[PDB]
Amino acid sequence: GKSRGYRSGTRYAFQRDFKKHGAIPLSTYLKVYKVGDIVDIKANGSIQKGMPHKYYHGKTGIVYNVTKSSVGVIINKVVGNRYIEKRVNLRVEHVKHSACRQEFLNRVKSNAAKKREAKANGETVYLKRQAAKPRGSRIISTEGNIPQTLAPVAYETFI
Amino acid sequence: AKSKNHTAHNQTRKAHRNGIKKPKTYKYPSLKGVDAKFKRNHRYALHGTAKALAKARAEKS
Amino acid sequence: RKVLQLLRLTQINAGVFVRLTKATSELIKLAEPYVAYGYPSLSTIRQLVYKRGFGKVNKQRIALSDNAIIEANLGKFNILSIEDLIHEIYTVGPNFKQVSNFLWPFKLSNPNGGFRARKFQHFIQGGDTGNREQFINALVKQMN
Amino acid sequence: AISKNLPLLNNHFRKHWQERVRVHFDQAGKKASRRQSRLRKAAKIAPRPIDALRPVVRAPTVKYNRKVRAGRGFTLAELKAVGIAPKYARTIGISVDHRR
Amino acid sequence: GRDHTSKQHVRSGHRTAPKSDNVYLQLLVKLYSFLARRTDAPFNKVILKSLFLSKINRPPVSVSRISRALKQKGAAEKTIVVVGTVTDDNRLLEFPKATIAALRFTAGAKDRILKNGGEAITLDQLALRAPKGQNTLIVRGPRNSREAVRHFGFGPHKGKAPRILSKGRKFERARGRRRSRGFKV
Amino acid sequence: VNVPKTRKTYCKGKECRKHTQHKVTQYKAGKASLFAQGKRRYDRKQSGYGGQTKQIFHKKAKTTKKVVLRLECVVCKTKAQLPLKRCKHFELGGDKKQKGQAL
RNA sequence: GUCUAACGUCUAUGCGAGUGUUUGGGUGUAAAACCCGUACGCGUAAUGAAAGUGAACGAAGGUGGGGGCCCAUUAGGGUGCACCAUCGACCGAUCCUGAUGUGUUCGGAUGGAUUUGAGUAAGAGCAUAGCUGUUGGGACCCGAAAGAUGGUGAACUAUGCCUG
RNA sequence: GGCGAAAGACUAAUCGAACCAUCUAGUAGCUGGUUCCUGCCGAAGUUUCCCUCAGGAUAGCAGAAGCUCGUAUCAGUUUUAU
RNA sequence: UUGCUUAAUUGAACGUGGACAAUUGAAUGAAGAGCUUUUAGUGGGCCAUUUUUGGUAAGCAGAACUGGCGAUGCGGGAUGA
RNA sequence: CCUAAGGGGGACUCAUGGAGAACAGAAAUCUCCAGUAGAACAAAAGGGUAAAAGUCCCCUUGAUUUUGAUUUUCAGUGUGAAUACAAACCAUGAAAGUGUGGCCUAUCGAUCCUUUAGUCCCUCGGAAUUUGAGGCUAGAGGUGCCAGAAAAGUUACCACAGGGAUAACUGGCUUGUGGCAGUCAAGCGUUCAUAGCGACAUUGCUUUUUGAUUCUUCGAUGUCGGCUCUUCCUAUCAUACCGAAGCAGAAUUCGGUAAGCGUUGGAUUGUUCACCCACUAAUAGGGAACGUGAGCUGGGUUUAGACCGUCGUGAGACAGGUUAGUUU
RNA sequence: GGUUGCGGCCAUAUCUAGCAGAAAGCACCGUUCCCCGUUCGAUCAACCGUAGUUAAGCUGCUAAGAGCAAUACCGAGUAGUGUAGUGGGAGACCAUACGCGAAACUAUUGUGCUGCAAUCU
Numbered sequence A: 001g002k003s004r005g006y007r008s009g010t011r012y013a014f015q016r017d018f019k020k021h022g023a024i025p026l027s028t029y030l031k032v033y034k035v036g037d038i039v040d041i042k043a044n045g046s047i048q049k050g051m052p053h054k055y056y057h058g059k060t061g062i063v064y065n066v067t068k069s070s071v072g073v074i075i076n077k078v079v080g081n082r083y084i085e086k087r088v089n090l091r092v093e094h095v096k097h098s099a100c101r102q103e104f105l106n107r108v109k110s111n112a113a114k115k116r117e118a119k120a121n122g123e124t125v126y127l128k129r130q131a132a133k134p135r136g137s138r139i140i141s142t143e144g145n146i147p148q149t150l151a152p153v154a155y156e157t158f159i
Numbered sequence B: 001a002k003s004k005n006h007t008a009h010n011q012t013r014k015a016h017r018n019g020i021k022k023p024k025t026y027k028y029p030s031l032k033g034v035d036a037k038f039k040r041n042h043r044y045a046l047h048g049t050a051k052a053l054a055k056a057r058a059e060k061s
Numbered sequence C: 001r002k003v004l005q006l007l008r009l010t011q012i013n014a015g016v017f018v019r020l021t022k023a024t025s026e027l028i029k030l031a032e033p034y035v036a037y038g039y040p041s042l043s044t045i046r047q048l049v050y051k052r053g054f055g056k057v058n059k060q061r062i063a064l065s066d067n068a069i070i071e072a073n074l075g076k077f078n079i080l081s082i083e084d085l086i087h088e089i090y091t092v093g094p095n096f097k098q099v100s101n102f103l104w105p106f107k108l109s110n111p112n113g114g115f116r117a118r119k120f121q122h123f124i125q126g127g128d129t130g131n132r133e134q135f136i137n138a139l140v141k142q143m144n
Numbered sequence D: 001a002i003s004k005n006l007p008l009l010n011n012h013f014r015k016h017w018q019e020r021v022r023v024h025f026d027q028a029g030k031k032a033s034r035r036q037s038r039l040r041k042a043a044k045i046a047p048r049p050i051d052a053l054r055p056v057v058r059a060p061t062v063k064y065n066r067k068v069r070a071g072r073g074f075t076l077a078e079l080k081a082v083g084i085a086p087k088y089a090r091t092i093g094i095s096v097d098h099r100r
Numbered sequence E: 001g002r003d004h005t006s007k008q009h010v011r012s013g014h015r016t017a018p019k020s021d022n023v024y025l026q027l028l029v030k031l032y033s034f035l036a037r038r039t040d041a042p043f044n045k046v047i048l049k050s051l052f053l054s055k056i057n058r059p060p061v062s063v064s065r066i067s068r069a070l071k072q073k074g075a076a077e078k079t080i081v082v083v084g085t086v087t088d089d090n091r092l093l094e095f096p097k098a099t100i101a102a103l104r105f106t107a108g109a110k111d112r113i114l115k116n117g118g119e120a121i122t123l124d125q126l127a128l129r130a131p132k133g134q135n136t137l138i139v140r141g142p143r144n145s146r147e148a149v150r151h152f153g154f155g156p157h158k159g160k161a162p163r164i165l166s167k168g169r170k171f172e173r174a175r176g177r178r179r180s181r182g183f184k185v
Numbered sequence F: 001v002n003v004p005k006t007r008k009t010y011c012k013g014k015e016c017r018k019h020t021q022h023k024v025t026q027y028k029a030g031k032a033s034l035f036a037q038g039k040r041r042y043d044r045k046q047s048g049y050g051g052q053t054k055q056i057f058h059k060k061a062k063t064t065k066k067v068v069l070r071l072e073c074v075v076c077k078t079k080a081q082l083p084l085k086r087c088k089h090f091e092l093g094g095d096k097k098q099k100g101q102a103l
Numbered sequence G: 001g002u003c004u005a006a007c008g009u010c011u012a013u014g015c016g017a018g019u020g021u022u023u024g025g026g027u028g029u030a031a032a033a034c035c036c037g038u039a040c041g042c043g044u045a046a047u048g049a050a051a052g053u054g055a056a057c058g059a060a061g062g063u064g065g066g067g068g069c070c071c072a073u074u075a076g077g078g079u080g081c082a083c084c085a086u087c088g089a090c091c092g093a094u095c096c097u098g099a100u101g102u103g104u105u106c107g108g109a110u111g112g113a114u115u116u117g118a119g120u121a122a123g124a125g126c127a128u129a130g131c132u133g134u135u136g137g138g139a140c141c142c143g144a145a146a147g148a149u150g151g152u153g154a155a156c157u158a159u160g161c162c163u164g
Numbered sequence H: 001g002g003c004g005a006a007a008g009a010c011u012a013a014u015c016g017a018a019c020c021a022u023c024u025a026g027u028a029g030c031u032g033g034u035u036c037c038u039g040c041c042g043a044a045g046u047u048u049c050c051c052u053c054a055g056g057a058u059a060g061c062a063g064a065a066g067c068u069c070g071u072a073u074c075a076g077u078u079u080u081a082u
Numbered sequence I: 001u002u003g004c005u006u007a008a009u010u011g012a013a014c015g016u017g018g019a020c021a022a023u024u025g026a027a028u029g030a031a032g033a034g035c036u037u038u039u040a041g042u043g044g045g046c047c048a049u050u051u052u053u054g055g056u057a058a059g060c061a062g063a064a065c066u067g068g069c070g071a072u073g074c075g076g077g078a079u080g081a
Numbered sequence J: 001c002c003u004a005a006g007g008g009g010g011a012c013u014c015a016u017g018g019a020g021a022a023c024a025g026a027a028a029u030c031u032c033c034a035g036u037a038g039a040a041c042a043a044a045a046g047g048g049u050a051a052a053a054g055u056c057c058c059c060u061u062g063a064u065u066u067u068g069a070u071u072u073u074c075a076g077u078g079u080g081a082a083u084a085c086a087a088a089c090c091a092u093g094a095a096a097g098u099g100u101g102g103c104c105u106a107u108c109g110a111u112c113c114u115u116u117a118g119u120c121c122c123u124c125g126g127a128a129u130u131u132g133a134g135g136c137u138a139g140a141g142g143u144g145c146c147a148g149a150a151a152a153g154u155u156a157c158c159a160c161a162g163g164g165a166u167a168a169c170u171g172g173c174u175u176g177u178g179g180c181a182g183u184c185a186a187g188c189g190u191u192c193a194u195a196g197c198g199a200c201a202u203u204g205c206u207u208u209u210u211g212a213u214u215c216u217u218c219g220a221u222g223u224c225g226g227c228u229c230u231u232c233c234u235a236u237c238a239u240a241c242c243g244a245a246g247c248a249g250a251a252u253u254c255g256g257u258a259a260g261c262g263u264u265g266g267a268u269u270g271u272u273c274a275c276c277c278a279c280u281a282a283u284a285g286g287g288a289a290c291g292u293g294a295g296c297u298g299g300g301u302u303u304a305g306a307c308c309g310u311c312g313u314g315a316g317a318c319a320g321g322u323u324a325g326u327u328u
Numbered sequence K: 001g002g003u004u005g006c007g008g009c010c011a012u013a014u015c016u017a018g019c020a021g022a023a024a025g026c027a028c029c030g031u032u033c034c035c036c037g038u039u040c041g042a043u044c045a046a047c048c049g050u051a052g053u054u055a056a057g058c059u060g061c062u063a064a065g066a067g068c069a070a071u072a073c074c075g076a077g078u079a080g081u082g083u084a085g086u087g088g089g090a091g092a093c094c095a096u097a098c099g100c101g102a103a104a105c106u107a108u109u110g111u112g113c114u115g116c117a118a119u120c121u
């Protein structure tokens, strides 16, 4: 007999973290979610109402609806050869703001401040990010660092 | 008799000939499922908003 | 396969220029079992561009037989000559992307003198794939 | 047996329908013979008209009330009003309807 | 061998000629094949393309739509171009004086345009008074009001029209359209 | 299963439109009338020759039935029906549980 | 892998809020061609089980895009059909409210509702033809073991009888 | 139906239901076959339902017709952040 | 702007007006992107590396990813899906 | 399965251990300390839970009403189940709040028909009244093969369409099993591991067993055995030449090269196999489509006739016994 | 800086054993008519701030403390793993090549930080 129930295979996924069981710290209930916010979904095993399905555990999406104790999140789920918009109702215990917004919103502010300062200075500044490039030339001083010559060591048994 | 029970072989090939395609995004998403109390009120705020803007342009004509 | 397609390497003995960053380096690492690559000398670049240099103009593979073709397609990037293009490639310039994408992938022949006894193993282990660094110049001399 | 997005049809061809196919090849021939018979009847009874005088009557039902068409015969009251006996009227090219 | 990043030997997927063998429709494309080839005016390239379209791709344009199109601000004397038939609308209370260039006019449309002081010219007459399509306004008919589109994309909870021959309470109204008869889709 | 003989639920009658006290009774299927059209059609179909004309169910699988409560409002006498889950045993207004007593 | 009846998509054509002459009538150089019209079919209104009711707040709506056209002068602005996403308005059903009134049980104004329709929102259809696809037909061609109706056999043979 | 000292035997080389003609071109998810050339594109044996398991429907894979547009913003890939 | 929300002049959503101009905010590629209708065949599969289950095992039976054969000739493995 | 084992609130803290108290003891009841849950939460298991979700107490019926959206299975159809709101009416608590059944993951059911409830509304079509009937909305009566026919057997008298998509021979992979052989050497062998043996282990070989599988053959490869005849293998029974011995002789046993050469006559049995009698130098074991049926024979098996026993109500069944049964 | 009330993160804050703690606060502490709750004013309820005490709670310090946290020329580029070859090996398995890279172990260091309001030697 095959078993494919709603919470099948969630033995470890829906567990609380080790030494992190019990009551929810109330910052979870004090956070404010607005329509358009990006939130990660991670199911709390101790709150059984409003739990996401195991598919959305570990997924990240956008809030589209705000209710008394829950938020609505839009997830794009792959079904065959296209994506389908899934609209999941989640209590805020299973939701956390995505930390990817605050870095990108910070890169926008930093770009704006430098650009307006080069404009103030009558100069130019380049803002496109670049991947790490190969390192330049350099000179190695040997004062205190004359090279030590190594050789492969013979075979030994240590038991 | 007895046959093959299940296999996902060749299924990712079939999904990637023309699919695994991201849906298009639009400036206004559909508001299906948003709270009815807000949605009823969002109707009156927009209709009234349209009234104020209509009068401002009717002056400027 | 997708990585090689994105490097415009869609046939055997096809050659392309890559500016080493981290993104393009990890790309080449993905294609490593199927490519031989290395650090090209200035003369190797010149020989490639002179003999097998073609441009992509309105999606067509056109021989670089006159500096006017190069000017008409890369003058907004300050390339007015075949030597401007070679200079922009060799000392990787601010417009390396446009200049290298305008260049159609080089279609080399097989080496005169052959490959090693078995190609598809790293150059370090006696094969041909992976980074050979300065011996790519000898290989291009064999194949171009 | 059922396939695609198509309308569901009711094609009543489960009997021996091919034994009961009437193809009207003789449309033109019967038209011509009808015309010749009609000419024959006219030359037989000339100059008396081939058509009896028909009354004018309202069409029944709520759908055809507005329309008026040719009836079958003039009522006995109508013929009485013009001083023609029905027995005599049938002999002078007038149609009678005892039912209306 | 090649690792093809796209399908090889693919036709463009656009009409390059009318499907029609009407000799007079191809004479107009011959005029606009020349115009699209030589004037650099974007109007002429659109007309040549529009002359290739099929019948369902050239919906009839009512004379009321042209009336509403002429009611745009600063459009009272623009020249209306309809690549197709312009039909009449007996629901209008009034029609302006207008110049309309079309492939065809219906009798009511032609009478009403000329009765109200307007002109009903063909597209070749247009190409002489406006070889670059200056001060024009192209009107296209409704493409999605066609009956066949009612049944396109039919499915559960899709709200389209079933393909059905008869209409009534006994025809596809019980089970699957009603919660008292099972479910509703 | 033990259900009290009274209950305070919503009354849908227009006069009440509120929770009233409702008498609880077990619903009983009425006697099948001989002039329901399906019985009229069934009797005509079975007549004559041809044998049994409609199917007869045999392959019983359920061992219970859904118990239905008839809730009649004491204010307006409007009846309401509530189905319960499948129970093998069911009493109305039985002896309430006594927790703590000995065997 | 056919023909036919009825159909889906696409395309060409005629006319177009209409369309279809051919049931029939006229006519004829006679199954042709030519001509005629009342009706009728489909379309032009939907929705509800039904009684029934029945489509403009507005320039027949607003927003973000939108080819083309207009003014410009890189840019920018105006106008923006078709079409896309979205929010509204209107008609029918359902539920709620229930004005003046009244065959005092009828009437249903007004204002609403995460409800609902194969609807409106300046018509798009009708008709002919072709390929392809659908269903019924023998149905791409050939093929059962069987079932039914009506008839012909006891010159073989089984059994009775008659005469040898 | 007959007939059977009984074998399901015999009933015109036909018998666990004769022969003749018709219904009848009986039906067949099963066999077999299915007729000229070249050009371009080009699969599936997987999902769900089915007295479903040699079959259908359904989605997918494929072709064809195109239509709206013309670099708009996409990717069987990398980088960075999370 | 609102008939929702706040003790509120607080907020929510959608807006008017103003500021930030081509390094408009990583790489690489892009025979361009988006969209629609309709229909065929198919719905027995098998193999190789690796992960892997039953089994002493099997040229056995069953799954995971990819690539193949099927549907494919050509050079090599003598011969061989 | 549950009127609470549902809902709300409140109070308390569980398993277990130590130290103590008449009868009283390992277990009765009482006390303190310790006690992260080592318990309890209907039922499988997992997750979850400590001023609680557990234990106890108080009050209750939200296990109620109208319909929409969503998640899982998914075709993004149905069913089941669940989630978050909208609009009511309520319960509880000082309150914030919570409550749309069971802490979460299983605990279930279409069309047609009937029955009940609701609206007391629409229709019975020439017009009314009242019965009756028919409509609209929600439940119930059920399909467990659970997307849901109404259903007992036999055929050894048999038929048809097919299938090597699938069994009964050979053949192919495997070699558990069967058979044969090694290595290590604790023991046996009067002493003495290895003359001859050899446990516990362990590595193999073979395809003369039986399994396992289902690749070939179902538009057919004649299925047992015997007779006849040829050939091949060696894991050698005899014969030749030799090595070893717990080889005095005789006999015997172990081994090497060795398949050149032979390996029988009979009673019973269809037999293969078996078992006896007897000769013999010896009466070894096997393969060749389990060699060999257009070579035979046809005793067995396996059509139809028939008998018995057991089984079956019966038609009939038996891989049980018996007899007769076309070898092109 | 101490202290109280309400807290955020929820052991660098916990556990065990000692010792210390000014001022204020907190606390133990006294009483039972009243509201209230118990077998028991022990808990809960109410009253007094009067009669007493820092003994306890609490706070801080001590401990090669247990536990916890952080760091690393610690272990270890080890185990494992993505990719490659007509590499090795009868096989079991192993080496190499381009990449990614633990856990335990060991050593060292640390033992709450802090928001709003009020108050104090």
Ligand SMILES: CC(=O)O[C@@H]1[C@@H](O)[C@H](O[C@H]2[C@H](OC(=O)[C@H]3CC[C@@H]4[C@H](C3)O[C@@]3(C[C@H](OC(=O)/C=C/c5ccccc5)[C@H](C)CO3)[C@]43CO3)O[C@H](C)[C@@H](O)[C@@H]2OC(C)=O)O[C@H](C)[C@H]1O
Pocket (backbone or CB within 6 Å): F032, F038, F039, F042, F054, F055, F056, F057, J112, J113, J114, J141, J142
């Ligand atoms: C004696 C007996 O046991 O046989 C009865 C038969 O007599 C009975 O016939 C009834 C007959 O049944 C039918 O014609 C079918 C109607 C619906 C189908 C089926 C039978 O009932 C189902 C099955 C199932 O529920 C039942 O089973 C119904 C039981 C029933 C009993 C009495 C009256 C009505 C229904 C679904 C819930 C829906 O209804 C349905 C889809 O299968 O209907 C007539 C009105 C009755 O007169 C008639 O009852 C009598 C007295 O004879 O039907 C039952 C199914 C049988 O079990």
Ligand SMILES: NC[C@@H]1O[C@H](O[C@H]2[C@@H](O)[C@H](O[C@@H]3[C@@H](O)[C@H](N)C[C@H](N)[C@H]3O[C@H]3O[C@H](CO)[C@@H](O)[C@H](O)[C@H]3N)O[C@@H]2CO)[C@H](N)[C@@H](O)[C@@H]1O
Pocket (backbone or CB within 6 Å): E147, E165, G041, G042
């Ligand atoms: N009047 C009903 C029938 O109509 C038939 O004719 C119908 C068909 O010939 C023709 O079919 C058209 C089709 O060509 C066109 N491309 C699309 C259109 N929807 C179809 O019409 C269809 O829908 C209409 C209702 O809208 C039905 O009445 C009609 O039967 C059906 N064929 O449209 C006609 C409209 O009825 C026949 N004359 C006959 O069977 C009968 O008269």
Ligand SMILES: NC[C@@H]1O[C@H](O[C@H]2[C@@H](O)[C@H](O[C@@H]3[C@@H](O)[C@H](N)C[C@H](N)[C@H]3O[C@H]3O[C@H](CO)[C@@H](O)[C@H](O)[C@H]3N)O[C@@H]2CO)[C@H](N)[C@@H](O)[C@@H]1O
Pocket (backbone or CB within 6 Å): none
């Ligand atoms: N530091 C680089 C790494 O990149 C990793 O992932 C990067 C890519 O490898 C990965 O790409 C995956 C691709 O592997 C997978 N096969 C398909 C998937 N659609 C891609 O996903 C990505 O692209 C989609 C749109 O295509 C976007 O939603 C998004 O940028 C990202 N999820 O997603 C990232 C690119 O955006 C991880 N994010 C993380 O380990 C780390 O950031």
Ligand SMILES: NC[C@@H]1O[C@H](O[C@H]2[C@@H](O)[C@H](O[C@@H]3[C@@H](O)[C@H](N)C[C@H](N)[C@H]3O[C@H]3O[C@H](CO)[C@@H](O)[C@H](O)[C@H]3N)O[C@@H]2CO)[C@H](N)[C@@H](O)[C@@H]1O
Pocket (backbone or CB within 6 Å): C026, H082, K100
């Ligand atoms: N444990 C942190 C998780 O790892 C994520 O991503 C980590 C891995 O998943 C990711 O691995 C990527 C892989 O996704 C991708 N498909 C292929 C890529 N080669 C891998 O990257 C690997 O190699 C690159 C250099 O080539 C290194 O920079 C990287 O550290 C290494 N893991 O590299 C990251 C190394 O930390 C994110 N870094 C982080 O936000 C997330 O929480």
Ligand SMILES: NC[C@@H]1O[C@H](O[C@H]2[C@@H](O)[C@H](O[C@@H]3[C@@H](O)[C@H](N)C[C@H](N)[C@H]3O[C@H]3O[C@H](CO)[C@@H](O)[C@H](O)[C@H]3N)O[C@@H]2CO)[C@H](N)[C@@H](O)[C@@H]1O
Pocket (backbone or CB within 6 Å): F030, F031, F033, J117
């Ligand atoms: N209820 C019993 C049935 O009623 C029959 O007669 C009934 C019918 O004439 C009529 O019943 C109508 C019916 O026409 C119609 N098709 C359906 C409608 N729901 C019925 O209505 C009836 O039933 C509902 C249900 O509870 C009641 O609320 C209501 O008071 C009652 N009139 O009203 C009568 C009952 O008041 C017979 N009396 C009886 O033989 C039959 O079994």
Ligand SMILES: NC[C@@H]1O[C@H](O[C@H]2[C@@H](O)[C@H](O[C@@H]3[C@@H](O)[C@H](N)C[C@H](N)[C@H]3O[C@H]3O[C@H](CO)[C@@H](O)[C@H](O)[C@H]3N)O[C@@H]2CO)[C@H](N)[C@@H](O)[C@@H]1O
Pocket (backbone or CB within 6 Å): J172, J211, J212
């Ligand atoms: N030697 C083993 C195998 O034997 C096979 O041949 C057959 C025989 O060895 C053996 O057949 C036996 C038979 O020996 C015996 N005397 C009678 C038995 N009815 C037969 O078959 C029996 O065994 C087979 C195999 O498991 C199964 O079908 C079943 O258990 C049973 N029918 O099993 C095989 C199939 O029946 C293969 N043909 C051969 O290639 C292979 O070597």
Ligand SMILES: NC[C@@H]1O[C@H](O[C@H]2[C@@H](O)[C@H](O[C@@H]3[C@@H](O)[C@H](N)C[C@H](N)[C@H]3O[C@H]3O[C@H](CO)[C@@H](O)[C@H](O)[C@H]3N)O[C@@H]2CO)[C@H](N)[C@@H](O)[C@@H]1O
Pocket (backbone or CB within 6 Å): J281
């Ligand atoms: N041929 C091979 C061998 O011959 C052997 O033969 C046996 C005897 O015939 C022989 O014994 C001797 C023989 O050595 C010698 N050279 C000749 C003498 N006549 C034999 O004598 C033997 O046979 C005679 C006659 O029948 C008897 O009377 C006497 O009892 C018997 N010992 O030696 C064996 C002792 O029993 C055996 N049959 C056997 O080992 C084997 O078959």
Ligand SMILES: [Mg+2]
Pocket (backbone or CB within 6 Å): none
């Ligand atoms: Mg629950």
Ligand SMILES: [Mg+2]
Pocket (backbone or CB within 6 Å): B003, B004
């Ligand atoms: Mg299958």
Ligand SMILES: [Mg+2]
Pocket (backbone or CB within 6 Å): B005
């Ligand atoms: Mg299965």
Ligand SMILES: [Mg+2]
Pocket (backbone or CB within 6 Å): C113
């Ligand atoms: Mg040479």
Ligand SMILES: [Mg+2]
Pocket (backbone or CB within 6 Å): E001, E002
């Ligand atoms: Mg080629």
Ligand SMILES: [Mg+2]
Pocket (backbone or CB within 6 Å): E145
């Ligand atoms: Mg319209």
Ligand SMILES: [Mg+2]
Pocket (backbone or CB within 6 Å): none
């Ligand atoms: Mg909808």
Ligand SMILES: [Mg+2]
Pocket (backbone or CB within 6 Å): none
């Ligand atoms: Mg019908």
Ligand SMILES: [Mg+2]
Pocket (backbone or CB within 6 Å): none
């Ligand atoms: Mg339901």
